[PDB]
Amino acid sequence: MRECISIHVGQAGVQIGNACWELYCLEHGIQPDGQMPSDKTIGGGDDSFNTFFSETGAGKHVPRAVFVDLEPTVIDEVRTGTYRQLFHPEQLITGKEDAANNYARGHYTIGKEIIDLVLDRIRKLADQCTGLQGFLVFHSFGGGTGSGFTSLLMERLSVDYGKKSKLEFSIYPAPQVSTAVVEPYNSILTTHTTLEHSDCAFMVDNEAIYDICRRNLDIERPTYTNLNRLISQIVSSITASLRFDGALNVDLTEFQTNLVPYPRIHFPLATYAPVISAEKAYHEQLSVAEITNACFEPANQMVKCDPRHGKYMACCLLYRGDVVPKDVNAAIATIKTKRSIQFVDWCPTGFKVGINYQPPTVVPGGDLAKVQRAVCMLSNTTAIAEAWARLDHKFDLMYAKRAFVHWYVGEGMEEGEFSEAREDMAALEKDYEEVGVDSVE
Amino acid sequence: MRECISIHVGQAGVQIGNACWELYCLEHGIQPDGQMPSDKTIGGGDDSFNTFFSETGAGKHVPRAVFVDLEPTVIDEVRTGTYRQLFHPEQLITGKEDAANNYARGHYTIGKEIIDLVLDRIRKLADQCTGLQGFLVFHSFGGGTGSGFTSLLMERLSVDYGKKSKLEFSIYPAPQVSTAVVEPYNSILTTHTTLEHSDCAFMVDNEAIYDICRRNLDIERPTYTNLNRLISQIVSSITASLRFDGALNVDLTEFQTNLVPYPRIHFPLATYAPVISAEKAYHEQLSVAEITNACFEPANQMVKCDPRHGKYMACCLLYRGDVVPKDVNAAIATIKTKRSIQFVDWCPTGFKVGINYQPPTVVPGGDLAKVQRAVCMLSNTTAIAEAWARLDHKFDLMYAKRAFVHWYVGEGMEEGEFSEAREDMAALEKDYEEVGVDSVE
Amino acid sequence: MREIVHIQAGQCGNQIGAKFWEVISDEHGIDPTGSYHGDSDLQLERINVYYNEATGNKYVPRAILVDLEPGTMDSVRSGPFGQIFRPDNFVFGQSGAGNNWAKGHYTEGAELVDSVLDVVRKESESCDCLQGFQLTHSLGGGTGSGMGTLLISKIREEYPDRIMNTFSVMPSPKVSDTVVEPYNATLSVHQLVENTDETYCIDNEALYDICFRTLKLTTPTYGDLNHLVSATMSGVTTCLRFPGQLNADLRKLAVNMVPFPRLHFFMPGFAPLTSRGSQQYRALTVPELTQQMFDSKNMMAACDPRHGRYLTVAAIFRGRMSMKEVDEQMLNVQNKNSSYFVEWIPNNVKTAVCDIPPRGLKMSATFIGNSTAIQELFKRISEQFTAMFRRKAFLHWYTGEGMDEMEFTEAESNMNDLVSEYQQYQDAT
Amino acid sequence: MREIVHIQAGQCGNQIGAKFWEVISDEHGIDPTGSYHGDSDLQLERINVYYNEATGNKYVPRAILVDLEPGTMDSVRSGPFGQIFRPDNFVFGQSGAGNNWAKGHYTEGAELVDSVLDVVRKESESCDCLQGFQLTHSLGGGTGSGMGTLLISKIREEYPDRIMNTFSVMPSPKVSDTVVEPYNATLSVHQLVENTDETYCIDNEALYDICFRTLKLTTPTYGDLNHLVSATMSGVTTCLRFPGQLNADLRKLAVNMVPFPRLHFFMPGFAPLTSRGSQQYRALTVPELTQQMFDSKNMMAACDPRHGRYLTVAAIFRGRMSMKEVDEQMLNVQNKNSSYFVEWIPNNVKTAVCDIPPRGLKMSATFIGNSTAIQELFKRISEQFTAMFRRKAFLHWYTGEGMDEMEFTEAESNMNDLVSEYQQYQDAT
Ligand SMILES: CC(=O)O[C@H]1C(=O)[C@@]2(C)[C@H]([C@H](OC(=O)c3ccccc3)[C@]3(O)C[C@H](OC(=O)[C@H](O)[C@@H](NC(=O)c4ccccc4)c4ccccc4)C(C)=C1C3(C)C)[C@]1(OC(C)=O)CO[C@@H]1C[C@@H]2O
Ligand SMILES: CC(=O)O[C@H]1C(=O)[C@@]2(C)[C@H]([C@H](OC(=O)c3ccccc3)[C@]3(O)C[C@H](OC(=O)[C@H](O)[C@@H](NC(=O)c4ccccc4)c4ccccc4)C(C)=C1C3(C)C)[C@]1(OC(C)=O)CO[C@@H]1C[C@@H]2O
Ligand SMILES: Nc1nc2c(ncn2[C@@H]2O[C@H](COP(=O)(O)OP(=O)(O)OP(=O)(O)O)[C@@H](O)[C@H]2O)c(=O)[nH]1
Ligand SMILES: Nc1nc2c(ncn2[C@@H]2O[C@H](COP(=O)(O)OP(=O)(O)OP(=O)(O)O)[C@@H](O)[C@H]2O)c(=O)[nH]1
Ligand SMILES: Nc1nc2c(ncn2[C@@H]2O[C@H](COP(=O)(O)OP(=O)(O)O)[C@@H](O)[C@H]2O)c(=O)[nH]1
Ligand SMILES: Nc1nc2c(ncn2[C@@H]2O[C@H](COP(=O)(O)OP(=O)(O)O)[C@@H](O)[C@H]2O)c(=O)[nH]1
Ligand SMILES: [Mg+2]
Ligand SMILES: [Mg+2]
């Protein structure tokens, strides 16, 4: 059984999980009080709720998730809210003071006081699994709990489990827009666990999703509730072939065989192509051809980036719905025809097609439309180093004058760890300069 | 599939396109909300809507057009008006300030801010095509957006596409009637892209269509809504054999093989012969013979010109309706008999007959009549240089005192470009003196 | 998009603008309180040209009211439309201007202009894409002349690419009610030269003569003179608010009304203007509107265009009319009167045709003329100025307030120079 | 969880806190007797931030009231909310402070501080997990300056890791009503340096100027000045009590408002503030709130931030608003005004967005600024101090109470040193 554990850390990590666990309850037909309605005398595991919902006896579906925060406030929206008896009470873990935009508090001072309680709960979910696939850690680079605690947890999850995949769904700091002043110090320090302990780390940022809401979707003034529904469509498409029938299904390990070249080259950016408002979803030609081109567009990226400045290394096309595979090969061969899209010279078999039958679900109150087809494109490219050079420069400005360092040293870390994590991220950026360039003799 | 992209630039370019896209919706039987009615279980592509209308699934016909203006006001008549859900919302592109009768603003200052947005939309229509024929750019010489932006766009469309035909449908300044004081400066500066980048440029002017409405049609007081319906009948007849059955059909490239001698001799004037009011359409003998003679009449020209002062070089007769071809050859041989009509001495096979079956459509509320037959005559002649000498003289008066130059220099161009575009148009006028004259030894 | 900030200054500029915000607020159906009570859907599509929308579907004008005396502010608040304006835009001092240019441009105006420009930038920074400005003021007062040209010359340093035009009242020797008005007008024509994109010069003698001869009014008041001026001010920016067949913005006019820079002094004009009673006798057609716009007795500037040549003119028509008759009547004038138009510019006339006439009549029109005959204005001032200043009359009221004579003689000479700029472009081929 | 002990001291600090416990007690629906009469369920979920629950669903504030004179205690008991406080937290002596720092910090304050800290620890030891403290006091009195900084410097010895911040009133030379206030303020800025995590410096001249210019009040009282201050004090700890989209505690602000330690003197600010009548003319939106929070005339500290650079600022928004407009308007300010922000820190601004606006308005906001222009405050005191002390004026009222001159010159020099700490971090790249 193709089970997965979702881990939601910090305020952004919880609040995305409200948008994820809204969606799977609709994809599988589960009421907010955990009940499937009485008109289903069919195969539930044939609809395969059993990757996100362990079936309690006497008709009850409790999720395979743990919400962790160091702050009591965010998880108390889930108690009550509307999902007040969807979740088990012991898998909603709150602290008493948050890490308060401080990596040293989330990793050393405050984080060690609940880290035994979090890890002990994951084992009670790891023992209920038969065929555990891997972990789905959600957080944000640039919190205290999203960076300090998650760095503490991914160390401990690598020692206990190790061989499992551990996917991350991070929120990376945006170049112009920022909400925290100490936002660059908490992102250089989470670099060590992101490359070492995770096996495939994703990054998004809020500017690149603000522009998609404004341009592709005509929302004039988005909130975070609009954005996290777009993160959740990426996740719902990625983990889809675990739990629905289709030709060319893709497990979570068939990504990493086909998306990750070298063990430090595992930072792929995602897109999602039919982000179309419902009025613009008429006048449509939302075929396989048009939805394949939109993923390669540099304006529709989920990261503020431009893949025309670097070279792609792999892609991973995951389609949902009314999709016939001969339409996909006719759309790949147009993508390889274009000279704007540079692959590397050691790729030559470009990328991997996955297809699924289950079409996407329209959230009531949602912003999206009701489409027949949708594509997530996970794709390694060398252009994600440019997002890192725009954040090293902000770190190098503030740490040149050692500004906010006195908060971090007086909480459980040393001054010398800044000079190690700056070199550590500068070594990845040297790896992308050396993996993109073709070789001669 | 014989698809064509219509590009409508500026106020005159949009407002002609309201008269064009009114007409094709009636020729193909499309309601203003893009719907064909339910009584058509026949071949739609056999009626061939598919040169001007891409069929969205679930019964919806969206045009292959983009309306561009630098002013918000003109395209907001299309939102709402009546065609408020005929057009896709992303192909109606407005700026925020117009170029304001200033070529330097439309080409340098303001035009570059939306030129990436316009070109990116054309590619989304160029990718929906299977068998793209060419571009139909509508504008007006003597605006700012009609001249400055269109010069910017035709440069970029020549680099991206190149091999495609790019037809222009310009409105040229009239000799006595003018509406702008700086009308001659914006017409010498659009000369460079009109001869270099377009492949077959048409010219009309408002005086020569005012006289047709007053004399051939007995409208005492025409508006622009009367005139643009006459421009649209020229276009609907030219592009007709792409999308209707008939003996002797003519593609858009069979013009240029048969109408254009040399690559700089591509400025042909059009006429349209049965411009007859409905009361005068009784007492008629509107046969092939009478409708062929009317095109060669110097009063029925769409340009204020007189082809008895120069020599014809080619013609191109395009007939619609109840037309038998033996009637055409008996009408050609009368035209070659007359000595008022001078061909050149290197033509001798005079001109090309195209015939189509689909008779013209009477617009409700229109001025025209319901005829069985109609003829558009595209015809190169050396007499169109006389319209150019009447406009060089207005440019040479104002630029002798360097009058309105300070508006143009302080917006993104130099004083020296006036002296290049004046020489550039004086070289075409030297070409028509040297192409009309027969050769001896 | 294409917003307009309105900066009415002084007594005369506030009285015009108070009547101006009663005509615009009728064109868009704005209640005296500020609510909307229109019936056409075009009255709201471009209402943001003048009106910021406030809480609860109230529409506040984007107008900034300046004075150096609290009295005219108290009149506008207590008038019919005191409810319409925002109370944070009533900027006023306490000590009056003295009908003195120096006191409103140097001593007591420079003390206030910091507290006015800080309010100008609250309006301009909230707009989506601002187009320009408009002053309504009076050459001949203390605040309209002096304080108005201090406000102008401090916006071109900050907004140096926006259309700034003025609707300014110029004095006339036939109608005087101020002794020192040549000093106060010469010192502000000098500022209007280097700082303004269009200047709509208006007189009062030209406005009684329209009321006396054309309108056949018996007892004209200032409320009748400002009513004419406010019909011009709405007519110029019509195609900015309503859809048309030809459009013409503020910048589109300035491109082809102003051949050379520094020649930006226009003569306005309105048509139709009939008496009451004699409107059942005039048929309203395009040749009828054209005859009023080119008769000399329908100019709002006291000049005769037969003493010069029109460089360029513009005609903005409002109504469901044709385009042939507009393009032919504007042609049949500049051939019948070809000795009154400059002949090195073919087709001196610009036609703009909107679709929306005013709310009580069909087919209005607006004439805007760039004539060389406006040197008749600048020489009637520069003869009075040089007859007082050669005896240094009334001068210590100016040199006592910071000025000196070097500012006068410079300003006299720049007035006399542009007389020799319309003179060159009148004659000599 | 995350409780706050409130220690209001003196006359001025008690008058602010008595108005402060009338705003919080409206936000949570607390009756004047102490019962609950709210309607929203969010008013009770985090009511333990300020209120201990007592017998029979009564809610007693966690406030400790200090004075050296029984008179202000009698006013607060006999006010509207004398019923709300517990009578065991009215700690007061009998012999007054004298507007004397030494008499309230050494002689008659040290005699009382044993009987105050024993009450502070009854509140702190009953909490589940205490977060921090807050003093409300007055630099310029005897009890607010002296006794307040004795209370502070004896809690950091016992609670050395809790957020202690003060809402302290600083004097201004334009508004004086105390001769010896430079002596009393310099000797307590020296204590606030080494002992405090955040300090929200407030003036009174900055609070009349908000009432005069912004609020357009005619006769402001102290009840109006404390009403502004109490709207700041509730605004800072909003995300501590109500759920939000971004959260910001007291510690979360202090992490990214304070770059270097010892630079912890903040300028508060509130928005919206309109006059009555002129609220139907302002539309309430995020670009409207942002313009008030960065205008200089909406600072509760009498400074101009154009004489320096903001090190860091914070903006706490309260209402159902977006996050793009918050993240964009806070971006469009620190690029338009990039010469007024320190450039070695990218993105100086912290956004906090709650979900619950105040109970009479939608979309409020709170500006908190760490500006380098606060050296204008500390030099106006340290010029008055060094002009009195060089003649040793009014000194025997201090040396007679145990002090000596060595405490003065140390305290003068520590004030003059941190002037040279904002000066270094203003300029020099
Ligand atoms: C029965 C009828 O048709 O009456 C007409 C009328 O008789 C005449 C004489 C009107 C009348 O105008 C005047 O007498 C007048 C008074 C003071 C200043 C200027 C004019 C009229 O009052 C003026 C009024 O104008 C309007 O309604 C326009 O919309 C006009 N509105 C205002 O000026 C206005 C007045 C009061 C309150 C609010 C607005 C306008 C013009 C340009 C731009 C915006 C608005 C009209 C057509 C008439 C009357 C009512 C008699 C005339 O004026 C205008 C501006 O139209 C004067 O010559 C014209 C020709 C009109 O036919
Ligand atoms: C019809 C209407 O909307 O009236 C508003 C109002 O007109 C204005 C002018 C209010 C008004 O405030 C003042 O005039 C004022 C008086 C003394 C000190 C400070 C302000 C208002 O009195 C204040 C009142 O504020 C509240 O209700 C808040 O919840 C506020 N409450 C108190 O301060 C309070 C007052 C008395 C008793 C208990 C509490 C608050 C603010 C922050 C944190 C907690 C509470 C509001 C919105 C208004 C009136 C009633 C006119 C303004 O103030 C506030 C605090 O909102 C002044 O500028 C704002 C803008 C408001 O629009
Ligand atoms: N996309 C998205 N991003 C969020 C959301 N909430 C917060 N963020 C981002 O998260 C960053 C800060 O992390 P937080 O989640 O606020 O803080 P934390 O991870 O909970 O750790 P603490 O600071 O101790 O609360 C901000 O810069 C936001 O950009 C959200 O709901 N959606
Ligand atoms: N036949 C015809 N000509 C028009 C029409 N509208 C405008 N024109 C002509 O176009 C010329 C000016 O160009 P415009 O379209 O008005 O201006 P533009 O091209 O939109 O560029 P801008 O000046 O920036 O608005 C005028 O001289 C008219 O002769 C129309 O509807 N039909
Ligand atoms: N047209 C018109 N002119 C006016 C009005 N009020 C005053 N004037 C003229 O303006 C001139 C003086 O300008 P003034 O109003 O005194 O300006 P100020 O003193 O600077 O505020 C005088 O000659 C008046 O004739 C008015 O309401 N309408
Ligand atoms: N804002 C405000 N200031 C006050 C109030 N009462 C007194 N002050 C100011 O506080 C300063 C002196 O502090 P004081 O109240 O006398 O403190 P104390 O003598 O130590 O108790 C004086 O300058 C007053 O202006 C008040 O209610 N509000
Ligand atoms: Mg948190
Ligand atoms: Mg236009």
Coordinates of N, CA, C and O in Angstrom, one line a residue, chain D residues 199-241:
Chain D
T199 N 12.1 50.0 23.4 CA 11.7 51.2 24.1 C 10.9 52.0 23.1 O 11.5 52.5 22.1
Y200 N 9.6 52.2 23.4 CA 8.7 52.9 22.5 C 8.7 54.4 22.9 O 7.9 54.8 23.7
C201 N 9.6 55.2 22.4 CA 9.7 56.6 22.8 C 8.5 57.4 22.3 O 8.3 57.5 21.1
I202 N 7.9 58.1 23.2 CA 6.7 58.9 22.9 C 7.0 60.3 23.5 O 7.6 60.5 24.5
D203 N 6.5 61.4 22.8 CA 6.5 62.7 23.3 C 5.1 63.2 23.5 O 4.2 62.5 23.1
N204 N 4.9 64.4 24.0 CA 3.6 65.0 24.1 C 3.5 66.1 23.0 O 2.3 66.3 22.5
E205 N 4.5 66.8 22.6 CA 4.5 67.7 21.5 C 4.1 67.0 20.2 O 3.3 67.5 19.4
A206 N 4.6 65.7 20.0 CA 4.1 64.9 18.9 C 2.7 64.5 19.0 O 2.1 64.0 18.0
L207 N 2.1 64.5 20.2 CA 0.7 64.0 20.3 C -0.3 65.2 20.3 O -1.4 64.9 19.9
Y208 N 0.1 66.4 20.6 CA -0.8 67.5 20.3 C -0.9 67.7 18.8 O -1.9 68.0 18.2
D209 N 0.3 67.6 18.1 CA 0.4 67.8 16.7 C -0.4 66.8 15.9 O -0.8 67.1 14.8
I210 N -0.5 65.6 16.4 CA -1.4 64.7 15.8 C -2.9 65.1 16.0 O -3.7 65.0 15.1
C211 N -3.2 65.6 17.2 CA -4.5 66.0 17.5 C -4.9 67.3 16.8 O -6.0 67.5 16.3
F212 N -3.9 68.2 16.7 CA -4.2 69.5 16.0 C -4.3 69.3 14.5 O -5.3 69.6 13.9
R213 N -3.2 68.7 13.9 CA -3.2 68.7 12.4 C -4.0 67.5 11.8 O -4.8 67.7 10.9
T214 N -3.7 66.3 12.3 CA -4.3 65.1 11.7 C -5.8 65.0 12.2 O -6.7 65.0 11.3
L215 N -6.0 64.9 13.5 CA -7.4 64.6 14.0 C -8.3 65.8 14.0 O -9.5 65.6 14.2
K216 N -7.7 67.0 13.9 CA -8.5 68.3 13.8 C -9.3 68.5 15.1 O -10.5 69.0 15.0
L217 N -8.8 68.1 16.2 CA -9.4 68.3 17.5 C -9.2 69.8 17.9 O -8.2 70.4 17.5
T218 N -10.2 70.3 18.5 CA -10.2 71.7 18.9 C -9.6 71.9 20.3 O -8.7 72.8 20.5
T219 N -10.1 71.2 21.3 CA -9.6 71.3 22.7 C -9.1 69.9 23.1 O -9.9 69.1 23.7
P220 N -7.9 69.5 22.8 CA -7.3 68.3 23.3 C -7.0 68.3 24.7 O -6.6 69.3 25.3
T221 N -7.3 67.1 25.4 CA -7.0 66.9 26.8 C -5.9 65.8 26.9 O -5.5 65.3 25.9
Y222 N -5.6 65.5 28.1 CA -4.7 64.3 28.3 C -5.4 63.0 27.9 O -4.8 62.1 27.5
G223 N -6.8 63.0 28.1 CA -7.5 61.9 27.7 C -7.5 61.6 26.2 O -7.8 60.4 25.8
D224 N -7.2 62.6 25.4 CA -7.0 62.4 24.0 C -5.6 61.9 23.6 O -5.4 61.2 22.7
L225 N -4.6 62.4 24.4 CA -3.2 62.0 24.1 C -3.0 60.6 24.5 O -2.4 59.8 23.8
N226 N -3.6 60.2 25.6 CA -3.4 58.8 26.1 C -4.3 57.8 25.3 O -4.0 56.6 25.3
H227 N -5.3 58.4 24.6 CA -6.1 57.5 23.7 C -5.3 57.1 22.5 O -5.5 56.0 22.0
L228 N -4.5 58.0 22.0 CA -3.6 57.6 20.9 C -2.6 56.6 21.3 O -2.3 55.6 20.6
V229 N -2.0 56.8 22.5 CA -0.9 55.9 23.0 C -1.5 54.5 23.3 O -0.8 53.5 23.0
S230 N -2.7 54.5 23.8 CA -3.3 53.2 24.1 C -3.7 52.5 22.8 O -3.9 51.3 22.9
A231 N -3.9 53.2 21.7 CA -4.1 52.5 20.4 C -2.9 51.9 19.9 O -2.9 50.9 19.1
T232 N -1.7 52.4 20.2 CA -0.4 51.8 19.8 C -0.2 50.5 20.6 O 0.2 49.5 20.1
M233 N -0.4 50.6 22.0 CA 0.0 49.6 22.9 C -0.8 48.3 22.6 O -0.3 47.2 22.8
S234 N -2.1 48.4 22.2 CA -2.9 47.3 21.8 C -2.4 46.8 20.4 O -2.5 45.6 20.1
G235 N -1.9 47.7 19.5 CA -1.6 47.3 18.2 C -0.4 46.4 18.1 O -0.3 45.6 17.2
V236 N 0.6 46.6 19.0 CA 1.8 45.8 18.9 C 1.7 44.4 19.3 O 2.2 43.5 18.6
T237 N 0.8 44.0 20.3 CA 0.7 42.7 20.7 C -0.6 42.1 20.2 O -1.3 41.3 20.8
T238 N -1.0 42.4 19.0 CA -2.2 41.9 18.4 C -2.1 40.5 17.9 O -3.0 39.7 18.3
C239 N -1.1 40.1 17.2 CA -0.9 38.8 16.7 C -0.7 37.8 17.9 O -0.7 36.6 17.6
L240 N -0.4 38.3 19.1 CA -0.3 37.5 20.3 C -1.7 37.0 20.7 O -1.8 36.0 21.4
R241 N -2.8 37.8 20.4 CA -4.1 37.5 20.9 C -5.0 37.0 19.8 O -6.0 36.2 20.1

